[PDB]
Structure formats: C-alpha cells, structure tokens
C-alpha cells in the first residue's frame, strides 16, 4: 500500500517535534530545513568545488553550486508534474499526498541542492587519490580471506592474526571501509556526524543515493545491483543508517522514494549544461557540436536537437542552447514524471533496480547521446585531463604530508589529543592543529563512546583516526587543497 | 480604489506573449517558466565571482553575490508565506484576487529576489563610483543644470549647452546626467530586457524596480516619492520600456510595484546579519568580541527589551548547553532564527497594514523604517558593521584597488569614445578598419550581446534627425558602461592587468 504519510517523516534525530501538527505546522517544519541548508557553509563551499572544468576562472562556467541549483529547478518541475499528473488521476488523496504536496516538492528541491555536498576537492580524482593512498597502506585485498599468511598491511593491529579471531571480522570491515571513500557516503557523514544539521529524517533520506555499505567486500546482489553500485554510507554510520532505516520505513538496502526524482533531475541537467560550458570554454562551435550529435545517433533527434538547431540559425549560440534546454526539458521531464508514477510500487519500497531513465526508451537514448558526445569531445580535452592529473597529486601529497599522524601509536596519539601540544612531537603537534576543530570533535566524540578495555578498541581508534583525516581532506575546496599543498611543500 | 491583484500579478510578456483565458494551473506554469530562465541565466552564474562586502574573498565560506542573493531568496519566501497566510485567515485572499494567484505571488518575490544585484558592477559601490567619476570628468553635468552658458566644461562637442537655443539642450541636459548616474538597479532593468533578453513576465520585471527615479533626473526630488526616488531605478535608454511597463501593471508615474517592498525586506535582513557572520569567520573579531560591540552600541536597553529576546537569548544558548561546531556556529543560527521569528511577521504585518498605499504604490516608507524597536535592531548591525567590519584596513584597501582597476579600464577604452560618429559607425559596419588598428581590436573585445544593443538601438533612429548624433553618443557610452559593469571582480582585474602589460 502506497501511503506517503508513512514515508514523509517530519521528525528529527535531535530535539524532535512530536505529535499531531497541522498541515501548516508540518510545512514550517520542512521550511526550517530550507533555512538550515541554504545558510549552511557546506553549501557555500560548493561555489569553489568543481564540476567538469577544474578551477575554471570565468564564472560563466558552472561550479558544483550553480549546477546543484539547476538540478533544484529540474526536480521542482518533475515533482510538480508528478503532483499534477497524479492529480489527473486523483491518486494523491489515495496515496496520502493530499496534505503533503509542499513537503513532496521541498524535499526534492533541498535534497537536489545537497547532493555532491560531500564530494572531495577534485571530483572523481579526490576519490581516487584517497582510496589509492589508503590501499597502498592497508591493503584490503589481503584481508579478504582467512589466515594468513604473508599479510601486506602496514597497520599492525589491522593485520589478520594467523591466529583466527572473530575480531578478524572487524579487521576486514575497517580495511574495506577506509579504501572505499565516496562523495555520497561522505555526504551522510557530513550532515549528521560533522555538521549536525538536525534536519527531518525525510530530508536526510533524500540524500541517500546509494545503499551499499562502504565496508562491503562481496560484489553481490542482483535484486539491488544498481542501488548498490557505489557505497552510500560508512561503517561509522551503520548505527545512524539503522535509525533512518526505521524512521522512513526502509528495508535493508532499500532507497527513499523521492531520491529517484533528484537522480533524474541530476542526470537531466548535467548532460546539457556541460555541453553549454564546452562551447563557452570554446572547445568547439555550436555547429561543430551539432555535427558531433548527428554523427552519434524523422526521429527524436529531429524532435529535440534538430528542432533547436534550425530555430537557432537566423545570438545563434544563445538561441541554440535556450531551445535545446527547453526541447529536452519538455520531452524528458514528463517521461521521468510518468516513469515514476508507472513504477511507483517498486519505487516506494525503494527496491526498483533501475534508474528513472530507461535504456530502452528513446528518451534515455537522448541522454546517453549527450553523455557520449561529452566523453569523447569534452572530458577528453587535454587541459581538462592535466588539471585532473594535477589534482590527484595535490590530494595524494596532502595525505603523505599528514601521514605522520597516522604513524603515531595509540598512546602517543591519544596523548596528543589531550595535551594539545606535546613536547616530543612538535611536527605532529602542529599538524594536528591544522585539522579543523569540527573534524577533531567528531573523532573525540566517537572514541569517547568506546569501551576503553575492549580488545577491539585499538582497531576502532585507528579507524576513526583515518576517518578524521579523510574528513579534513574531503571537506576542502579544489582551491584550498591546492594552496595547502603548495604552502606545506614550501613552494609558496 | 479596490485592492485587486488580478490587475497586478500579470501573466503577459512584451515579446511573443500568450493571450486567452488560462487556467490556474496554466498561470503557475507561466511563472515557473520564468524560474528556469533566471536560474539558467549566465547573468546569475556570474555572481559567484562578484563582490559582496568582501572583495575577492578566497574562501567560499564567505558570501558572494550569489550566495547572499540566494539566502535573500529564502527570506522573501518566509515573508510571502507569512503575508498571505495571515491574509487568507483575515479576511480575505479571495477579496483581493489572491485566491488563484498564490503561487505566482511567492514565485515573483523569490525570483525577483535572486535578481537584485544582478546589475551591480564589478567592484560594488566602487564600480558605481569609478564609472560616475570617470564620466563626470568628461561630461560635467554641473554646468548644464541651468541655461546658457557660459563656459561649458563639457568635453564633448555635440553635447555642450548651446547657446542660444536649441530647445534640444534639454536632450543634452538629460544625457549629461544619465551617463553620470549609473546605478546597479537601473542597470538591472536594462540587463534583463535590452541586453540579456529573457522576455520575462511584466509582473516579474516589476519586482526588480527597487526605485522609481530616472537617472536623468536633474531635480532635487519631490516630497511624496521622496524615498522611492532616492537612487535611479532606470535609464533614459528605457524611458519607453518603463512607459509600457507602467501601463501593463497599472502603475502611476513614480509608483512602485507592490511586491518590491517585500524584496527590500528580504534584502535588508539577510545582509546586515550575514555580514557579521563572515566578519567572525575572517577573524576580524570573535563572537565574544562582537557582543560587546552590540550592547555597547545599543541604547535605552535598560532591562528586559529586544536585545535580550534575540541576542542575549543566543548568548547564553551559545556558551555551552548545545553546540555542534562549538558556540559560534551555534550563536549564529540562533541569532539568525531569533531575528527572523521576531521580524519576518512584523514586516509581514506592515504590508497588510498599509497594503493600499503599498499596492497603489505610493507608500513613502519601507517595511522597516519606523523608529520601532524593530528597525532599531536592524540599525544595530548595520551600524556595528560600518564601524568595525567595513572599516577594516584590508577591506578598505581592496576597495581602493578596485576603483583604480575600473577607472583605468575606462581610460584604456577611452579611444572609442573619441572617434567621430562617422569614424565609429565605420568601425561598427566593417568590423576591421585599417587606419584604426588599436581602436578595432579594442572594439572586438566588447562582448557581442553589448554590441548588438548599440546597433539595434541606433538602427531604430531617424538618420536624418538633428538628434541622431546625440543619441549615437548616449548609446555609445552605454555600450561601454555595459561592457565594464557586466564583469566579475576577477575578470575586470585580469583585463586591467592583461591590457597594462603587467601579466
Ligand atoms: N573532467 C571530467 N569531468 C567529468 C568526468 N566525469 C564526469 N564529469 C562531469 C559531468 C558531470 O557533471 C559529472 C559526472 O559524474 P557524476 O559522478 O556527477 O555522475 P553520477 O550521477 O553518475 O555520479 P554519482 O552517482 O553522483 O556518484 O561530472 C571526467 O572524467 N572528467
Ligand atoms: N565593504 C563594504 N561593504 C559595504 C559598504 N557599504 C555597504 N556594503 C555592503 C554591506 C551590505 O552587504 C551591502 C549594503 O548595500 P546594498 O548594496 O546591498 O544596499 P541597499 O540595502 O541600500 O540596497 P541597494 O543595493 O541600494 O539595492 O553592501 C562599504 O562601505 N564597504
Ligand atoms: Mn550531480
Ligand atoms: Mn542585497
């Protein structure tokens, strides 16, 4: 039974609002989420994190913020058309949506603005630098089995004892969690553990795009081969992800129903907007582009792109994209809106193992067209490719810079935590001080909650120590990471 | 004259507008289409690089023009929602025509909130300064205030007051003031229409006219619209466009659009407060240091009062007993919330209270002017900021550099304003002229969109006219003011350095 009053939860993790509440009171609860997200520095920090073009110095190219805001308007159009199209059938009052029309919209808009919020300084190359740097240190490939036997892992406590323990299972989880950083998983850690934004459970579920646990070592399941594409949460949040699996009526590895609207609005706006930037960064011409599209496929091309191409020609360039946007928007937003209503049962359970755009439909054929033109003629450009190469070194150098903090022993590091300045560790003292306090309080809070006596305690302290470091790096700008790297290499 | 919002919340455009009936769902769609143009406009992306109080702030954690205009967007929402909700309960809504125009009411504010500042020049009020100063040295409007005569300090020729009329010295008199009175807002109106051409819905385009004074106004203002005409809100280049806009919305001369008063409020409130949040981030002072500046800035506080409900309230809430970024990040969203819960409705009421003078558009006040213990709160920041935030020496210095950057940039392109009409016109037609190598290449730099507006507007002239030379020059300096003003802090900075051969 599709009852959206049972999913759109307006309760919080802390200081929750309780009991009853008007249709207007439940609104103001979600209007408080808007003010919490818009005024957040983590959303401001996006005008300096990069989307497609690293460090692009002309504002006319989209950043993560201007992109996320355009996703926000596409999700509004999709949500408003699902409410209108589902109102053509009046199934709203049958689905519990008769009094949750605003929260339906608002959660999408807000969780559209908050994807990507946890992405590291250099896009898929921050992710790369981090996982690669941690694999070389704590090889998760070796802990896969049992034993045993020549364990190539530089951490002592995390090497598998030959030596069997069920505490060797903790070892296995940690080694794979830390080597599988993901913007989506780090986004959940960001809003809860690090920012403590409070927020409604619904809004916090609207940013959970993936359901695979980072520590997942086994490359399974079929039923959920798509929703478990990338990790969506870390070992450090297994508990929080459980409290939400309850609060939103989600099954294990099941997604929130409104996440599918954002994912559609995300894919829809980056495909076209990246080609708009490419022409602005003068990688090619409006004409040059058109032929790339034609050589890439009466059909849909004529309905959408050909349509805008002839309309553009007697700014022919302004002109070109204003329509291409509209034509794509007029044909793909309704396809998504209906495809949502069509598969609503599996989407409400959050088990639907496909994306809102069907590789079958000619409508999805249009999206893969836009993405393949960009992959061949934009993401392959050499100025993009080296800024990609530079960022991988910046982040990998930052990690090696701070490696001496991961080298200390539990006693020596804990000493450094309490004694802010330790005499015999001047270098580690000053390195520790560079770590943002927010990131430091999260390590303290989580380690305080541990059993001091436990034989697993040393293993958890190191996990949260490595997670504290990953929190620092990832919570950085493209630009702040580059400056810090140069400052600390004594070249600036 | 009855408060009827069917006569204001229009659904028409100036170009390729739809006509006929239109369902309530059709009217929402028509304003949601505007939304897609404003958000997807490059003119708004250009804000993540424009200055907000802090020039070229190198950490995203400080606000730009986009992030500030974004937070203002949310303050106008929280006010329309409290203005209309209070109106549906009493009486009414349907008696004002808002029963079917509820979504458009919100969307108009929300969108025209993102679009203030859209016309602001690269270096804030110092772009405004650098531009008016550089043009005053050329076209002294001080001399053409009266008649004659007698030694016109005007550096142009076809613009000196002659003489010996010519009752066309009034056109001269008008232009000599318009170009010396560029304004972030008046340039915003030119921007959405003449230059960017989004064709926005007359209602939406009325929500951005924060002022009603024409730039060419050479008078000492009136007494009724003695507020709404503090600064210019439009240029002579749009005198006609504002006529048709004043009609479609049934506005009398110098009367504001009813939703603009909401916008000033969303603006007034988001900056003053957010600026102090940044100052603390920039370590100018501490959240503690800040406080002292507030109660030492307050007056007649005595005992229980407003300061206590809002800032005192947040002061004790901050010093432990909750945190999650440790007292400061805490102090700020309480101070934000407290200021918001106790001010958004107050403003909301002021709207409903004077809604006739506010809807007929004549109310010579803003929804936060009166000596109410609530305006007293705004001035507190506002005055705390002007003394200990905007006066910092690193802020004052980058303001000085920006004045030089924009001022040199105008002097670099000064050669195009010196050519004669026939000389300039030739360079326009044949994009490349042989005896003007320097002037040709300077011309190619002037981004097209700005150029098309010069051709478009001049083509529409009477070439035979004795006015034609003077209109050619107005539209020429506007083409230059358009190029400069439509620049980022950083692009204007790089251009000055690229063209001074220092980088
Ligand atoms: N320069 C460059 N840009 C890329 C590359 N791949 C993607 N982009 C741009 C285009 C899009 O804005 C975005 C594409 O990747 P996303 O990870 O944002 O898409 P997707 O939704 O599949 O990932 P997600 O599920 O969010 O983790 O970045 C690349 O390899 N190089
Ligand atoms: N750095 C610096 N910032 C200033 C100064 N005066 C104002 N600001 C900043 C602080 C506020 O963000 C904002 C105040 O002016 P606005 O341009 O936003 O003014 P106003 O509310 O009069 O509306 P308007 O812009 O006239 O439409 O600009 C100054 O002297 N220095
Ligand atoms: Mn995205
Ligand atoms: Mn403002």
Task: Say if residues B155 and B219 touch (Cβ distance below 8 Å).
Answer: no
Beta partners for B7? none
Q: What distance in Å separates the CA atoms of residue B9 and residue B262, rounded to the nearest whole number?
A: 15
Virtual torsion, Cα B89, B94, B97, B101, nearest 10 deg: 70
Which pair of structure tokens corresponds to residue A360? 């079958």
Nearest Cα to B34, choosing from B14, B50, B19?
B14
The answer to whether residues A301 and A227 belong to one domain is no
Q: Is B20 left (phi over 0), alpha (psi -120 to 50) or beta?
A: left
> Which residues fall within 8 angstroms of residue A425, CB to CB, at 6 or more apart?
A408, A412, A416
Look at chain A and report how many structural domains it folds into. Answer: 3
Whole-number Å distance, alpha carbon A273 to ligand 1 midpoint, is 12
Q: What distance in Å separates the CA atoms of residue A70 and residue A238, rounded to the nearest whole number?
A: 32
Virtual torsion, Cα A237, A239, A243, A245, nearest 10 deg: 70
> Which residues fall within 8 angstroms of residue A52, CB to CB, at 6 or more apart?
A61, A62, A274, A277, A378, A379, A384
Please report where in the chains the tokens 């550096």 appear, as a residue: B155
Nearest Cα to A199, choosing from A411, A29, A418, A434?
A29
- B225 flagged as catalytic: no
Label residue B432 exposed, middle or buried (CB < 10 Å: 0-12, 13-18, 19+). Answer: exposed
Which pair of structure tokens corresponds to residue A372? 């393949």
Whole-number Å distance, alpha carbon B385 to ligand 4 midpoint, is 15
CB contact under 8 A, B66 and A70: no
Residues in chain A: 492
Please report where in the chains the tokens 């195009």 appear, as a residue: B416
Which residue of A29, A34, A66 to mutate against B (max B Cβ within 10 Å)?
A: A66
Whole-number Å distance, alpha carbon B244 to ligand 2 midpoint, is 31
Q: What distance in Å separates the CA atoms of residue B315 and residue B311, rounded to the nearest whole number?
A: 6
Chain B residues touching residue A29 (CB < 8 angstroms): none
- Element spanning B230, H or E: none
Q: What distance in Å separates the CA atoms of residue B50 and residue B47, rounded to the nearest whole number?
A: 5
Nearest Cα to A463, choosing from A136, A243, A172, A144?
A172
C-beta atoms surrounding B170 within 10 Å: 14
Task: Say if residues A80 and A99 touch (Cβ distance below 8 Å).
Answer: no
Domain's final residue, options A378, A400, A416: A378
Ligand 2 atom showing the smallest separation from residue B271 Cα: 12
Chain B residues touching residue A437 (CB < 8 angstroms): 326
Which pair of structure tokens corresponds to residue B387? 């003394």
- B267 flagged as catalytic: yes
Q: Three-state DSSP class for B386?
A: helix
Residues in chain B: 503
Nearest CB to B490 within list A57, A69, A196: A57
Q: In this structure, what DSSP letter does residue B218 have?
A: -
Q: What distance in Å separates the CA atoms of residue A182 and residue A214, rounded to the nearest whole number?
A: 8
Backbone angles phi, psi at B232, to 5 degrees: -75, 145
The answer to whether residues B265 and B369 belong to one domain is yes
CB contact under 8 A, A60 and B74: no
Helix (H), strand (E), coil (C) string for chain A: CCCHHHCCCCCECCCCCCCCCCHHHHHHHHHHHHHHHHCCHHHHHHHHCECCCCCCCCCCCCEHHHHHHHHHHHHHHHHHHHHHHHHCCCHHHHHCCCCCHHHHHHHHHHHHHCCCCCCCCCHHHHHHHHHHHHHHHECCCHHHCCCCCCCCECCCCCCCCCCCCCHHHHHHHHHHHHCCCCHHHHHHHHHHHHCCCCCEHHHHHCCCCCCEECCCCCCCCCCCCCCCCCEEECHHHHHHHHHHHHHCCCCCCCCCCCHHHHHHHHHHHHHHHHHHHHHHCCCCCHHHHHHHHHCCCCCHHHHHHHHHHHHHCCCCCHHHHHHHHHHHHHHHHHHHHHHHHHCHHHHHHCCCCCCCCCCCCHHHHHHHHHHHHHHHHCCCCHHHHHHHHHHHHHHHHHHHHHHHHHHCCHHHHHHHHHCCCCCCCHHHHHHHHHCCHHHHHHHHHHHHCCCCCCCCHHHHHHHHHHHHHHHHHHCCCHHHHHHHHHHHCCCC
DSSP string for B249-288? TT--TTPPPTTHHHHHHHHHHHHHHHHHHHHHHTTSS-HH
Which residue of B36, B50, B344 to mutate against A (max A Cβ within 10 Å)?
A: B36
The answer to whether residues A12 and A161 belong to one domain is no
Mutate to test the pocket of ligand 1, among A379, A385, A386 (most ligand atoms within 8 A of CB): A379
Q: Is the N-terminal amide bond of A288 cis, ω within 30° of 0? A: no
Please report where in the chains the tokens 């969108």 appear, as a residue: B111
C-beta atoms surrounding A370 within 10 Å: 22
Gap from A479 CA to chain B (nearest CA, Å): 9
Mutate to test the pocket of ligand 2, among B53, B71, B128, B230 (most ligand atoms within 8 A of CB): B53
Domain's final residue, options A328, A356, A378: A378
Q: What distance in Å separates the CA atoms of residue B265 and residue B268, rounded to the nearest whole number?
A: 5
Q: Please, what sign has the CA dihedral across residues B71, B74, B79, B82?
A: negative
Whole-number Å distance, alpha carbon B311 to ligand 1 midpoint, is 44
Which pair of structure tokens corresponds to residue B410? 């105008």
C-beta atoms surrounding B481 within 10 Å: 23
Angstrom resolution of this structure: 3.3
CB contact under 8 A, A59 and B46: yes
CB contact under 8 A, A44 and B63: yes
Please tell me the number of the ligand nearest to residue A69's CA: 3
C-beta atoms surrounding B372 within 10 Å: 12
- Element spanning B232, H or E: strand B232-234
Task: Say if residues A470 and A130 touch (Cβ distance below 8 Å).
Answer: yes
Nearest CB to A45 within list B58, B61, B337: B61
Chain A residues touching residue B82 (CB < 8 angstroms): none
Please report where in the chains the tokens 């079929």 appear, as a residue: A222
The answer to whether residues A39 and A95 belong to one domain is yes
Q: What distance in Å separates the CA atoms of residue B73 and residue A39, rounded to the nearest whole number?
A: 11
Task: Say if residues A191 and A114 touch (Cβ distance below 8 Å).
Answer: yes
Nearest CB to B45 within list A45, A59, A480: A59
Domain's final residue, options A378, A393, A417: A378
Any long-range contacts for A360-366 (C-beta under 8 Å, 24+ apart)? Answer: A361/A335, A362/A299, A362/A300, A363/A300, A363/A331, A363/A332, A363/A335, A365/A300, A366/A300, A366/A301, A366/A304, A366/A328, A366/A331, A366/A332
Catalytic residue among B45, B325, B441, B444: B441
Which residues lie near ion ligand 3 (Cβ < 5 Å)? A 116, 266
Q: What distance in Å separates the CA atoms of residue B129 and residue B92, rounded to the nearest whole number?
A: 47
The answer to whether residues A229 and A271 belong to one domain is no
Task: Say if residues A446 and A89 touch (Cβ distance below 8 Å).
Answer: no
Mutate to test the pocket of ligand 1, among A270, A273, A386 (most ligand atoms within 8 A of CB): A270
- A177 flagged as catalytic: no
How do A212-213 and A231-233 pair as beta strands? parallel
Q: Three-state DSSP class for B463?
A: coil
The answer to whether residues B196 and B293 belong to one domain is no
Q: What distance in Å separates the CA atoms of residue A321 and residue A305, rounded to the nearest whole number?
A: 9
Tally the C-alpha atoms within 13 A of residue B350's C-alpha that lie toward its C-beta. Answer: 22
Nearest Cα to B189, choosing from B232, B142, B156?
B232
Q: What distance in Å separates the CA atoms of residue B490 and residue B18, rounded to the nearest whole number?
A: 41
The answer to whether residues A393 and A359 belong to one domain is no
Please report where in the chains the tokens 């032929």 appear, as a residue: A291
Catalytic residue among A142, A151, A266, A471: A266
Please report where in the chains the tokens 């608002």 appear, as a residue: A106
Which pair of structure tokens corresponds to residue B33? 């289409």
Ligand 1 atom showing the smallest separation from residue A182 Cα: 27
Which pair of structure tokens corresponds to residue A221? 């399941």
Q: Please, what sign has the CA dihedral across residues B92, B94, B96, B102?
A: positive
Method by which the model was determined: X-ray
Q: What distance in Å separates the CA atoms of residue B74 and residue B118, rounded to the nearest whole number?
A: 17
* Nearest residue of B to residue A27, measured between CA atoms: B81
Which pair of structure tokens corresponds to residue B197? 């051409």
CB contact under 8 A, A63 and B40: no
* Nearest residue of B to residue A440, measured between CA atoms: B325
Catalytic residue among B68, B190, B213, B450: B68
Catalytic residue among B267, B268, B278, B482: B267
Task: Say if residues B115 and B107 touch (Cβ distance below 8 Å).
Answer: no
Which pair of structure tokens corresponds to residue A143? 């802990």
The answer to whether residues B191 and B225 belong to one domain is yes
- Residue B190: CATH number of its domain: 1.10.3210.10
Q: In this structure, what DSSP letter does residue B216 have?
A: T
Catalytic residue among A421, A430, A486, A487: A430
The answer to whether residues B460 and B382 belong to one domain is no
Q: What distance in Å separates the CA atoms of residue B170 and residue B147, rounded to the nearest whole number?
A: 10
Pocket of ligand 1 (CB under 6 A): A 51-52, 124, 183-184, 209, 230, 266, 270, 274, 379, 384, 388
Chain B residues touching residue A39 (CB < 8 angstroms): 71, 74, 333, 336
Which residue of A27, A35, A109, A319 to mutate against B (max B Cβ within 10 Å)?
A: A35
The answer to whether residues B189 and B291 belong to one domain is no
Which pair of structure tokens corresponds to residue A414? 């804990």
Task: Say if residues A368 and A357 touch (Cβ distance below 8 Å).
Answer: no
- A430 flagged as catalytic: yes
The answer to whether residues A272 and A147 belong to one domain is no
Q: Is A60 left (phi over 0), alpha (psi -120 to 50) or beta?
A: alpha
Q: What distance in Å separates the CA atoms of residue A175 and residue A127, rounded to the nearest whole number?
A: 16
Nearest Cα to A377, choosing from A307, A274, A267?
A274
Nearest Cα to B271, choosing from B66, B68, B62?
B68
Query: What is the Cα B250 distance to its own chain's centre?
Result: 23
Please report where in the chains the tokens 């993009």 appear, as a residue: A384
Q: State which residues form the domain around B369.
A: 257-389
Q: Three-state DSSP class for B213?
A: strand
Q: Three-state DSSP class for B364?
A: coil
Nearest CB to B78 within list A31, A48, A76: A31
Backbone angles phi, psi at A25, to 5 degrees: -70, -40
Please tell me the number of the ligand nearest to residue B119's CA: 2
Catalytic residue among B13, B65, B116, B350: B116
Helix (H), strand (E), coil (C) string for B84-149: HHHHHHCCCHHHCCCCCCHHHHHHHHHHHHHCCCCCCCCCCHHHHHHHHHHHHCCCCCCHHHCCCC
Q: Three-state DSSP class for B233?
A: strand
CB contact under 8 A, B48 and A66: yes
Helix (H), strand (E), coil (C) string for B16-73: CCCCCCCCHHHHHHHHHHHHHHHHCCHHHHHHHHCCECECCCCCCCCCCHHHHHHHHH
* Alpha carbon nearest to ligand 2 atom 28, residue: B53
Pocket of ligand 2 (CB under 6 A): B 52-53, 116, 184-185, 210, 267-268, 271, 275, 390, 395
Q: Is the N-terminal amide bond of B150 cis, ω within 30° of 0? A: yes
The answer to whether residues B313 and B237 belong to one domain is no
């Amino acid at each position: 039974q599709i009852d959206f009053r049972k999913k759109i939860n307006w309760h919080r993790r802390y200081r929750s609002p309780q009991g009853v509440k008007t249709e207007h009171e439940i609104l103001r609860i979600f209007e408080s989420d808007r003010g919490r997200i818009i005024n957040s520095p983590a959303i401001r920090r996006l005008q300096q994190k990069t989307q497609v073009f690293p460090l692009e110095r002309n504002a006319a190219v989209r950043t993560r913020l201007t992109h996320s805001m355009e996703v926000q308007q596409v999700g509004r159009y999709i949500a408003k058309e699902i409410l209108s199209r589902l109102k053509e059938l009046k199934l709203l009052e049958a689905y519990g949506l008769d009094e949750l029309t605003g929260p339906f919209e608002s959660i999408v808009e807000m969780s559209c603005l908050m994807h990507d919020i946890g992405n590291p300084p250099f896009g898929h190359f921050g992710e790369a630098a981090i996982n690669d740097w941690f694999r070389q240190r704590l090889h998760p490939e070796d802990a896969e089995s049992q034993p045993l036997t020549d364990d190539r892992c530089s951490v002592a406590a995390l090497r598998l004892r030959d030596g069997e323990e069920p505490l060797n299972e903790l070892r296995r989880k940690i080694r794979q969690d830390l080597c599988h950083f993901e913007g989506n998983a780090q986004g959940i850690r960001l809003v809860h553990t690090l920012m403590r934004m409070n927020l409604t459970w619904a809004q916090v579920g609207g940013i959970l795009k993936y359901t695979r646990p980072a520590w997942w070592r086994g490359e399974t399941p079929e039923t959920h081969h798509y929703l478990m594409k990338k990790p969506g949460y870390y070992l450090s949040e297994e508990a929080y992800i459980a409290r939400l699996r309850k609060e939103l009526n989600l099954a294990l590895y099941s997604r929130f129903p409104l996440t599918w609207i954002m994912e559609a609005a995300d894919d829809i706006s980056y495909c076209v907007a990246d080609l708009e930037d490419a022409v602005e960064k003068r990688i090619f011409t409006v004409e040059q582009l058109y032929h790339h599209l034609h050589e890439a496929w009466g059909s849909l091309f004529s309905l959408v792109v050909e349509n805008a191409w002839e309309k553009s020609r007697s700014s022919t360039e302004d002109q070109f994209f204003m329509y291409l946007r509209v034509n794509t928007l007029n044909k793909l937003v309704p396809y998504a809106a209906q495809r949502f209503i069509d598969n609503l049962p599996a989407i409400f359970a959050g088990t639907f193992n496909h994306a809102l755009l069907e590789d079958a439909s000619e409508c999805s054929d249009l999206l893969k067209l836009y993405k393949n033109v960009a992959v061949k003629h934009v993401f392959s450009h050499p100025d993009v490719e080296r800024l990609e190469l530079q960022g991988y070194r910046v982040i990998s150098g930052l990690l090696e810079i701070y490696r001496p903090l991961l080298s200390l022993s539990l006693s020596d590091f804990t000493e450094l935590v309490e004694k802010e300045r330790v005499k015999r560790f001047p270098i580690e003292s000053r390195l520790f001080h560079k770590l943002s306090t927010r990131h430091r309080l999260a390590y303290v809070e989580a380690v305080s909650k541990l059993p001091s006596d436990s034989p697993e305690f040393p293993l958890w302290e190191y996990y949260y120590r490595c997670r504290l470091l990953q929190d620092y790096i990832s919570g950085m700008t493209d630009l702040y990471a580059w400056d810090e790297y140069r400052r600390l290499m004594a070249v600036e």
